[PDB]
Amino acid sequence: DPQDVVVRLPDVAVPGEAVQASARQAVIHLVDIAGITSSTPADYATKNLYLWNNETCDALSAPVADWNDVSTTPTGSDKYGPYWVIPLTKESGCINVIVRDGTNKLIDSDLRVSFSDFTDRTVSVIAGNSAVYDSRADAFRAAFGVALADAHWVDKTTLLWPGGENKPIVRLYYSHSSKVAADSNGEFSDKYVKLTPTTVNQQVSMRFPHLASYPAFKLPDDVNVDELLQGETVAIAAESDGILSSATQVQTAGVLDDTYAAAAEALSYGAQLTDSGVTFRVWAPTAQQVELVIYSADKKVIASHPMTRDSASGAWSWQGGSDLKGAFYRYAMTVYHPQSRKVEQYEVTDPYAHSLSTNSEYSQVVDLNDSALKPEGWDGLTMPHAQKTKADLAKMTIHESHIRDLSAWDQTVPAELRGKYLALTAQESNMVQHLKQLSASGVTHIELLPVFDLATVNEFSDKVADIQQPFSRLCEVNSAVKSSEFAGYCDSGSTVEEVLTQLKQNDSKDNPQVQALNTLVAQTDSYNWGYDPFHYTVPEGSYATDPEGTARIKEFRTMIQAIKQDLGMNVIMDVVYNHTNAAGPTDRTSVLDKIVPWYYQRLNETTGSVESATCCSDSAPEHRMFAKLIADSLAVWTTDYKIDGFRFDLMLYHPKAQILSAWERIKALNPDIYFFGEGWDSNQSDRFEIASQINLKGTGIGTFSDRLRDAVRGGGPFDSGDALRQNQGVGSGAGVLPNELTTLSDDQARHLADLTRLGMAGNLADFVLIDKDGAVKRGSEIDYNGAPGGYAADPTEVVNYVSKHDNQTLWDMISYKAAQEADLDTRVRMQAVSLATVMLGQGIAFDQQGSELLRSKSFTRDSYDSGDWFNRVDYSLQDNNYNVGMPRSSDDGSNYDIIARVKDAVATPGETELKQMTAFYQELTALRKSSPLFTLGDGATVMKRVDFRNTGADQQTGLLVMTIDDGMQAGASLDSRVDGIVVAINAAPESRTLQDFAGTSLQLSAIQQAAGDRSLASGVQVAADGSVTLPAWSVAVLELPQGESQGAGLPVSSK
Ligand SMILES: OC[C@H]1O[C@@H]2O[C@H]3[C@H](O)[C@@H](O)[C@@H](O[C@H]4[C@H](O)[C@@H](O)[C@@H](O[C@H]5[C@H](O)[C@@H](O)[C@@H](O[C@H]6[C@H](O)[C@@H](O)[C@@H](O[C@H]7[C@H](O)[C@@H](O)[C@@H](O[C@H]8[C@H](O)[C@@H](O)[C@@H](O[C@H]9[C@H](O)[C@@H](O)[C@@H](O[C@H]1[C@H](O)[C@H]2O)O[C@@H]9CO)O[C@@H]8CO)O[C@@H]7CO)O[C@@H]6CO)O[C@@H]5CO)O[C@@H]4CO)O[C@@H]3CO
Ligand SMILES: OC[C@H]1O[C@@H]2O[C@H]3[C@H](O)[C@@H](O)[C@@H](O[C@H]4[C@H](O)[C@@H](O)[C@@H](O[C@H]5[C@H](O)[C@@H](O)[C@@H](O[C@H]6[C@H](O)[C@@H](O)[C@@H](O[C@H]7[C@H](O)[C@@H](O)[C@@H](O[C@H]8[C@H](O)[C@@H](O)[C@@H](O[C@H]9[C@H](O)[C@@H](O)[C@@H](O[C@H]1[C@H](O)[C@H]2O)O[C@@H]9CO)O[C@@H]8CO)O[C@@H]7CO)O[C@@H]6CO)O[C@@H]5CO)O[C@@H]4CO)O[C@@H]3CO
Ligand SMILES: [Ca+2]
Ligand SMILES: [Ca+2]
Ligand SMILES: [Ca+2]
Ligand SMILES: [Ca+2]
Ligand SMILES: [Ca+2]
């Protein structure tokens, strides 16, 4: 088309520098983009700089602090703009500048000119842009070149772009093999499509509501999208004469979904065994070439196959023989990546990989149904615990565990199984026997921290050193140790563990030496929580005895079978679909973003940079093919690994619709699978309806409740310093046993009691209780940091807990918070009292591995990379890992002062306390499952049967009294043995007497009577008249015994 105006650069040269700063000088160019378009010779008399020294930048020589002084006018100027020569006292550091016309800012931003980064101290700026450029050419190309990525090709015919609104020429340029750039004639001569303004359709605004305010443009219905998506596309806008306004890169995930997803969703992906052979398929709708590279066991290329592109789906496939089973493979990609703007060439593992080589370098063809990859009996393995009804689900009592935390320290686990899946098969080890005991007593589910393929442990054992090994080994594999203050131990002949123990003696807030060595250990040990996804649907390799090939698959299943069959527990996996470990075209662990660049990651709407609000490389579960990958991945964990439930990490970054979609998909495989996650606020509500506590009401999708958690623990996860001690919780005596720093008022204490009672009734929005002032409140009317406290529809949608892998352990919180006068035995009872609010509540019960052993991390708040030393759990019951060194200073350094003040208040728990806490713990879990009344499942049923005494403004502070009705006003007798239950948690130093049940023949539960002196209710007195005397820091479960008819019980009061 020749009538089309040709888009071109300004008909002016790219500018050199006006002047170059001399000694004790800096030079600022203002590149006058408007006057480069020229017309009228520009007048710069009113341009001026405001120059001042503060504390961070002070190099200016004679800065005039008078804001109203506009006399710092240009030193000179040429056709490209003015420049300023600025005297200096020094050529290092920086200067502060605001660029003005008169007193108005041309750049609404205090500028810092760093001599350290601009060594010739000669920089350029442009009006309306806070960026400091090294040269006018750079700034010039910034203004008249490609920049950012704010154009959004969202379906076949709709481009959303700011830069093109009310511009005469708006075009989508595209180049198959090079980056769209101006000619030798300054002309953009690459091929393009023409764009005409239009109106955002309803389907596009529904799909992309965060973009609905973007100026919309239409493409011809006959544009060949497949051709444009093969290379670079750049949206370009231009004036009426053809001069370039702006040019930006294009985000294409919307049009990729509109063009390909319907066809692509019908296909299955990865290396798939069939009856004819093996079918390979990978989704790569923008790739120019995909070659399947086949590797021998020793990683030699033994074949290379150009794959067949299916043009409806953008998937690539190839079919080979059945003998390819066990073979290693990668996809050789030829694909444009917008981040580098190059057509990249690299081999990538399969995102649908189901088996891996060591350290995930190669994917491997596997048939997960092979009986060689199954323990004997696998196919008939069943759930030891039902999950079918809401009452089934409410019984869930979760023990959140980590593969190394379980066995790394257990000398009774065979050495070669320590830190391995197979440690769970060590039937006589302390660890497994302790777990069996916990299961007999009513822990029902093991929840496993990441056992999918994580990135952050090196699976080549030669490159790893663990604290149980010689310190010389640590030196060999970690070259930083050589130049560390611990270098001398390289010759010591002792283990790293022996050195860390030795370092305990002089370790202090002033000499944090244990943490110092451990930070080096952490770089090259086997330890990480593993919230760092490499491949979503392969087991982690470092947890296998053999990480090379399929061995880990059978070992994983042997563990799963042992937990269900040897230990009697169901299994929940933590899954982390909300982010990838890395993105872009070069990083070793960028898998998804090498194959389909900019599709699987969530990007900033204007820069196209991968967002990091999760921590890392944010994913895009709102995109259709990643939603499919998630669902397909869960299908394998469900069917092929027999996982009973999934906990979604940062579920709030997922659309509600996508989570429910995945759930219906998985429920069609197994109807009893349970989904829950972290449903905080992801700040993504502008893009879709997030999968949050609030939005998931009624769905049956569970969420961690932070309500009872914070009320019982005290404070919040972002407390530091004195606040860690001041913010006592119900479990540590808020308002009844104050420590020396706190100012908690009685009203504040009663408010925590409201959140705790609300949580023990399942944290429902509609539950009705009497609040701290004696007023009638619905759950949703109790405040929690401004949000409605109660949010659920059924208690199965709420997971209560007072300790978790992240943030401080319960014991460390009690240690921060307990008054000096609380002795060691009282603190053990505070731990049990805290856990009682979870274990005796209607919400699903969740707890950190080792709360029953008073688990400590030496005050470490965030132990994800703190190794075996700080995450130690001692199943030989010698101690609780308390006081083993100051925690990592980079995250807890601002807590050293309060740590040192509170740390040594009482002795460190030893074997007597550990056994006592475990008995306490098993007493609580046995109580939880002793009656269906504790686990009613259905919220309306909770509302009809659960009530509280000792409420209102004159309540006895810290005394929690819950009643569960099994009498006629409620409905049927769900429990044949009792007409009602009373739960009384006396979180207080005073003994207390209940008269609410005078005359009722109330009696103590048989479980607690049988524990005798060892019971949380030791010393409870039930008088003849039915009054109950509760010791300090006690938990009592009482019951109305049943006679041969459902009695009156404990009718809920209508309020
Ligand atoms: O001395 C205490 C503060 O110390 C530190 O501040 C120093 C800076 O670090 C240092 O760089 C330098 O400041 C320079 C600054 O960085 C440059 O940007 C520039 O400032 C000029 C600015 O760019 C112009 O726009 C203009 O300012 C006008 C402004 O735009 C206009 O809106 C109005 O300002 C009024 C505010 O709108 C109004 O809210 C109110 O201000 C409140 C304020 O909001 C409130 O927070 C409180 O101020 C606190 C402050 O928050 C504290 O942090 C602390 O200040 C210290 C800083 O933190 C350090 O950074 O204490 C303050 C309490 O005294 O109370 C204010 C009420 O008084 O009123 C505003 C004024 O009426 O008016 C101006 C009109 O000119 O001109 C600016 C310069 O004139 O140049 C700065 C160099 O002067 O120096 C700082 C030390 O002086
Ligand atoms: O994103 C990086 C962080 O990731 C990890 O954080 C995870 C948490 O550990 C985990 O518990 C969960 O958090 C959710 C939480 O469980 C839910 O309850 C809820 O959180 C809400 C909370 O309950 C409410 O109280 C309220 O918070 C208010 C708060 O009460 C109030 O005091 C104030 O907050 C101020 C702080 O008190 C004050 O100290 C300071 O905070 C600074 C901080 O000092 C500084 O170091 C820096 O923070 C860093 C941090 O040090 C880094 O380690 C890293 O944080 C990560 C965590 O460590 C991970 O464990 O990066 C941070 C910076 O990005 O900067 C802080 C300030 O920005 O000032 C605070 C105010 O500015 O106000 C708030 C009210 O706004 O609302 C809470 C909502 O967030 O939901 C949580 C979901 O985030 O999951 C986390 C997963 O990421
Ligand atoms: Ca320069
Ligand atoms: Ca791994
Ligand atoms: Ca580590
Ligand atoms: Ca956002
Ligand atoms: Ca009954």
Catalytic residues: 649, 678
The residue to mutate among 578, 678, 718, 748, having the most atoms of ligand 2 within 8 angstroms of its beta carbon, is: 718
Question: CA 759, CA 771: separation in Å to the nearest integer?
Answer: 13
Ligand nearest to the CA of 1042: 7
**Residue nearest ligand 2's atom 74 by CA:** 718
The torsion of the CA quartet 912, 918, 919, 922, rounded to 10 degrees, works out to 180
Alpha carbon of 91 to those of 57, 118, 737, 807: distances in Å?
12, 11, 60, 46
Question: What does this entry list as its resolution, in Å?
Answer: 2.0
The residue to mutate among 52, 54, 70, having the most atoms of ligand 1 within 8 angstroms of its beta carbon, is: 54
The domain limits of the chain are: 1-139, 140-247, 248-366, 367-946, 947-1055
Pick the CATH number of 248-366 from 3.50.50.60, 2.60.40.10, 3.40.50.300, 1.10.287.1080: 2.60.40.10
**Distance from CA of residue 485 to its chain's centroid?**
34
Q: How far is the CA of 25 from the centre of ligand 7 (A)?
A: 90
Q: Is the dihedral of CA 503, 508, 510, 515 positive or negative?
A: positive
CB 392, CB 795: distance < 8 Å? no
* Ligand 1 neighbourhood includes 67 CB (under 6 angstroms): yes
Output the six-digit token pair for 852.
């029953």
DSSP string, 971-1017: -S-S-SSEEEEEEEEE-SSS-EEE-TTTTS--EE-HHHHHHGGGSTT
Q: How far is the CA of 611 from the centre of ligand 6 (A)?
A: 8
C-alpha R_g of the chain: 33
Tokens 């980590």 found at: 402
* Ligand 1 neighbourhood includes 378 CB (under 6 angstroms): no
Q: Is the dihedral of CA 759, 761, 763, 769 positive or negative?
A: negative
Determine the length of the chain: 1055
**Residue nearest ligand 1's atom 12 by CA:** 54
**Residue nearest ligand 2's atom 83 by CA:** 680
Query: Could you tell me which CATH class the domain 367-946 is placed in?
Result: alpha beta
Ligand nearest to the CA of 27: 3
Ligand nearest to the CA of 888: 2
The environment of the single-atom ion ligand 7, i.e. residues with CB closer than 5 A, is: 966, 973, 979, 1046
Q: How far is the CA of 107 from the centre of ligand 1 (A)?
A: 17
Output the six-digit token pair for 350.
């399969």
**Residue nearest ligand 2's atom 41 by CA:** 718
CB 294, CB 265: distance < 8 Å? no
**Which residues approach ligand 2 with their CB closer than 6 A?**
680, 706, 716-718, 720, 785, 806-807, 862, 891
Residue 1052 amino acid letter:
V
- Phi, psi for residue 746 in degrees, rounded to 5: -55, -40
Ligand nearest to the CA of 718: 2
Q: How far is the CA of 543 from the centre of ligand 4 (A)?
A: 9
Q: From its phi and psi, is residue 602 left (phi > 0), alpha (psi between -120 and 50) or beta?
A: beta
**Residue nearest ligand 2's atom 8 by CA:** 717
**Residue nearest ligand 1's atom 79 by CA:** 67
Output the six-digit token pair for 590.
């960028």
Query: Could you tell me which CATH class the domain 1-139 is placed in?
Result: mainly beta
Tokens 């069943």 found at: 382
Longest dimension (CA), the chain: 105
Alpha carbon of 537 to those of 322, 422, 544, 945: distances in Å?
22, 19, 15, 43
**Residue nearest ligand 1's atom 9 by CA:** 54
Neighbours of 735 (CB within 10 A): 21
Q: How far is the CA of 135 from the centre of ligand 3 (A)?
A: 5
The torsion of the CA quartet 435, 436, 438, 439, rounded to 10 degrees, works out to 120
Question: CA 727, CA 45: separation in Å to the nearest integer?
Answer: 60
Nearest to 788 by CA among 800, 777, 802, 772: 777
The answer to whether domain 1-139 and domain 367-946 are alike in fold is no
Q: How far is the CA of 1 from the centre of ligand 6 (A)?
A: 40
Distance separating the N- and C-terminal Cα atoms of the chain: 78
Tokens 């149980």 found at: 468
Question: CA 587, CA 594: separation in Å to the nearest integer?
Answer: 9
Eight-state DSSP code of residue 360: G
Nearest to 242 by CA among 39, 13, 6, 38: 6
Neighbours of 499 (CB within 10 A): 19
Alpha carbon of 653 to those of 537, 684, 685: distances in Å?
20, 7, 9
At the topology level, CATH places domain 140-247 in: Immunoglobulin-like (2.60.40)
Residue 873 amino acid letter:
V
Ligand nearest to the CA of 651: 2
* Ligand 1 neighbourhood includes 54 CB (under 6 angstroms): yes
What number does the ligand 2 atom closest to the CA of 723 have?
37
Residue 307 amino acid letter:
M
CB 215, CB 161: distance < 8 Å? yes
Enumerate residues 6+ apart whose C-beta is below 8 A from 877: 853, 911, 914, 915
Question: CA 470, CA 498: separation in Å to the nearest integer?
Answer: 9
Residue 209 amino acid letter:
P
Pick the CATH number of 947-1055 from 2.60.40.1080, 2.60.40.1180, 2.40.10.10, 3.30.200.20: 2.60.40.1180
Question: CA 169, CA 156: separation in Å to the nearest integer?
Answer: 20
Question: CA 726, CA 901: separation in Å to the nearest integer?
Answer: 13
Question: CA 716, CA 722: separation in Å to the nearest integer?
Answer: 13
**Residue nearest ligand 1's atom 87 by CA:** 54
* Ligand 1 neighbourhood includes 346 CB (under 6 angstroms): no
Enumerate residues 6+ apart whose C-beta is below 8 A from 1053: 947
Q: How far is the CA of 541 from the centre of ligand 4 (A)?
A: 5
| Tally of CA atoms within 13 A in the half-sphere of 288 that contains its CB | 16
The environment of the single-atom ion ligand 3, i.e. residues with CB closer than 5 A, is: 120, 122, 134-135
Q: How far is the CA of 72 from the centre of ligand 1 (A)?
A: 21
CB 42, CB 32: distance < 8 Å? yes
Residue 640 amino acid letter:
D
CB 816, CB 739: distance < 8 Å? no
